[PDB]
């Protein structure tokens, strides 16, 4: 049976980058030819494995993360990058294998006056360990004063909206990302090309 990529890429709403979803792909054929001939997919960068040769490889399983970020942060979804995304929201490991698809979604995930509910993490006590999601919303102690449950000066709340308007530039419009990941282990293989 064919790959169920129609339920990952063509979903109607994605998760925000501080709390993303991870789906498992198993028992299928990895037909990327329904996906690769979509040339407005403005980024198809592949670390670890090479593009256009995916259909002649056998794998164990495929994990497909999903979130939305603005266009100035797509260079941060990569092994070994920094910023206010790859240290506070979603950090890939250094020896990661998998392609990082990223296209433009300014018609889809954008509306007038902001679309206020795609959050992102501003403050954390330390940088993220790799593949660590973070959903906790306790207030961040910036200075030295423990304020204990009420925010103000030197203790803020660590989530702001993205405020996506369709009249921004090419850099501030929502670039919807899917970063698939591949794994190989000593086991029977359920995901391979035709």
């Amino acid at each position, epitope marked *: 049976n064919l790959c169920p990529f129609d339920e990952v890429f063509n979903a109607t709403r994605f998760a925000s980058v501080y709390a993303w*979803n*991870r*789906k*498992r792909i*198993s028992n299928c054929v990895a037909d990327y030819s329904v996906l690769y001939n979509l040339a407005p997919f403005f980024t198809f960068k592949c670390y670890g494995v090479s593009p256009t040769k995916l259909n002649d490889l056998c794998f164990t399983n495929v*994990y497909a993360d999903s979130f939305v970020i603005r266009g100035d942060e797509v260079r941060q979804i990569a092994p070994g990058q920094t910023g206010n995304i790859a240290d506070y929201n979603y950090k890939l490991p250094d020896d990661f294998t998998g392609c990082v698809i990223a296209w433009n979604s300014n018609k889809l995930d954008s509306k007038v006056s902001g679309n206020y509910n795609y959050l992102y993490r501003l403050f954390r006590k330390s940088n993220l360990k*790799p593949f660590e*999601r973070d*959903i906790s919303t306790e207030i961040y102690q910036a200075g030295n004063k423990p304020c204990n449950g009420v925010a103000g000066f030197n203790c803020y709340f660590p989530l702001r909206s993205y405020s996506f308007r369709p009249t921004y530039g090419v850099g501030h419009q929502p670039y919807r990302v899917v970063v698939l990941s591949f794994e190989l282990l000593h086991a029977p293989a359920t995901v391979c090309g035709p």
Partner: antibody, heavy 123, light 110 residues
């Protein structure tokens, strides 16, 4: 051939903190995906939070958020569970479990399970 | 936390085929994550029964069979005896890297 052993039973006053160990054995520790299982007596199981010691990540469950800090040491081949702010509802059995096949992705079954660590809270 | 709904107690007759459902959702089983099964004898740590929704490790007879179908699942136990008075658990994974276990099953003989 692979098995886990834990610390003995402990008693704690309401308000203290407990450190429960899980001493792994059998092979290498760097490929393990230890995830803790809490079980009050007479109820079902419950997931606590996973930790991959080759990365140091800690994906906690949404209930145990901000209460437990699951850490692991690579030298002593143990993975702790620093459950702080103990209450009267946390008397239970606490198991640790390797996660089957994979290491970088902990999404599998649980084998083995160690043995019980009845950390009860009373006076 | 435990998204998996499981029947509390199921029974039958000595020498029959008993089944156990495991109703998931679209966020745990329907997202492509597999479902295993555990067996808890009363007074020890639980065991491993079915992995990968159908297989069996070395140490269990061929009376133990399970399957998944879309969102739900099943576990068939043929031939009840005096080693089935125990607790069985349905295990899976949420889409958001979260762990789930079943509520609890009670298999009793007549």
């Amino acid at each position: 051939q692979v098995q886990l052993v834990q610390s003995g039973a402990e008693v704690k006053k309401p308000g203290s903190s407990v450190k429960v160990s899980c001493k792994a054995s059998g092979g290498t520790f760097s490929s393990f995906a230890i995830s803790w299982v809490r079980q009050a007596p007479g109820q079902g199981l419950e997931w606590m939070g996973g930790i991959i010691p080759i990365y140091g990540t800690a994906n906690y469950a949404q209930k145990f958020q901000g209460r437990v800090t699951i850490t692991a040491d690579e030298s002593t081949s143990t993975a702790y569970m620093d459950l702080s702010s103990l209450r009267s509802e946390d008397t239970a059995v606490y198991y640790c479990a390797r996660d089957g096949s994979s290491t970088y992705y902990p999404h599998n079954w649980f084998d083995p399970w160690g043995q019980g660590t009845l950390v009860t809270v009373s006076s | 936390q435990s998204v998996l709904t499981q029947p509390p107690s199921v029974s039958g007759a000595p020498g029959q085929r008993v089944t156990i459902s495991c109703t998931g959702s679209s966020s745990n089983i329907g997202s492509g994550y597999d479902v295993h099964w555990y067996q808890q004898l009363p007074g020890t740590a639980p065991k491993l029964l079915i992995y990968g929704n159908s297989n069996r490790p070395s140490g269990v007879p061929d009376r133990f069979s399970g399957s998944k179908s879309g969102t739900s699942a099943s576990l068939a136990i043929t031939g009840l005896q005096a080693e089935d008075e125990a607790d069985y658990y349905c295990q899976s994974y949420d889409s958001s890297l979260s762990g789930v276990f079943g509520t609890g099953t009670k298999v009793t003989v007549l």
